[PDB]
Amino acid sequence: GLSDGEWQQVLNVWGKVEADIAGHGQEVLIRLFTGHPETLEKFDKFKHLKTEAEMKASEDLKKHGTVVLTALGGILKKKGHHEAELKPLAQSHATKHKIPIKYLEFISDAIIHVLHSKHPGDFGADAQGAMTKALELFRNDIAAKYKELGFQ
Ligand code: HEM
C-alpha cells in the first residue's frame, strides 16, 4: 500500500526507464542472470548464453527486456489497481514458466541496482523507498496467487 506521494515518486522514476526501456530492460535481465545464474535455466531461449558479452550482444534479450518492463510499467501505472493485469502474469509464471517467488525477489533488487547504476546521484532515498515498496506490492500480490495455486 503506497501513498499518492509515493506513487508520484514511482512514476517519476519510471519516466527514467521509459526514456530507454530497452537499455534498462537489458541491464535488469543481465543483472539477474549474472547475479543469480540459476535464473538463466528457466529460459530455454537464453540458456545458451554463457557469457555476459553474449548477453549484452543479444538483441532477443533486449527484446525480452522490453516486454518485461513494458508489462511492469503497465502494472505500475495502475497504482495498485492491477488485478486484471497481474493475474495472467502470476498464472503463467506459476503454471507455465514455474518461477519461484524467490526469483521475483531477485529481479526486484536487480531493478533497484540498475537504477542506481544508470542514474547515480539521481535516484534519491525517497525514490528508492517508493520503488522498493511498489515492487514489494507487486511481489506480494503475485505471492497470493501462487499460494492459491499451491505453487512452490
Ligand atoms: C517484474 C517481473 C516480471 C515481469 C513483469 C515479467 C513479465 C513477463 C511477460 C510479459 C512475459 C511474456 C508473456 C508471458 O509468458 O506471460 C514473460 C515471460 C517469461 N518470463 Fe517473466 N516477468 C517477470 C519476472 C520473471 C522472472 C524473475 C523470471 C525467471 C527468473 C521470468 C521468467 C520468464 C520466462 C522463462 C518467460 C517465457 C520466456 C519465453 O520463452 O518467451 N520472469 N514474463
From Swiss-Prot:
- Disulfide-linked positions: none
Q: Where does nitrite bind?
A: 64
Where are the bilayer-spanning segments?
A: none
- Enzyme Commission designation: 1.7.-.-, 1.11.1.-
Modification type Phosphoserine: residues: 3
The task this protein performs is described as: Monomeric heme protein which primary function is to store oxygen and facilitate its diffusion within muscle tissues. Reversibly binds oxygen through a pentacoordinated heme iron and enables its timely and efficient release as needed during periods of heightened demand. Depending on the oxidative conditions of tissues and cells, and in addition to its ability to bind oxygen, it also has a nitrite reductase activity whereby it regulates the production of bioactive nitric oxide.
Q: What protein am I looking at?
A: Myoglobin
Q: Which organism is it from?
A: Equus caballus (Horse)
Coding gene?
Answer: MB
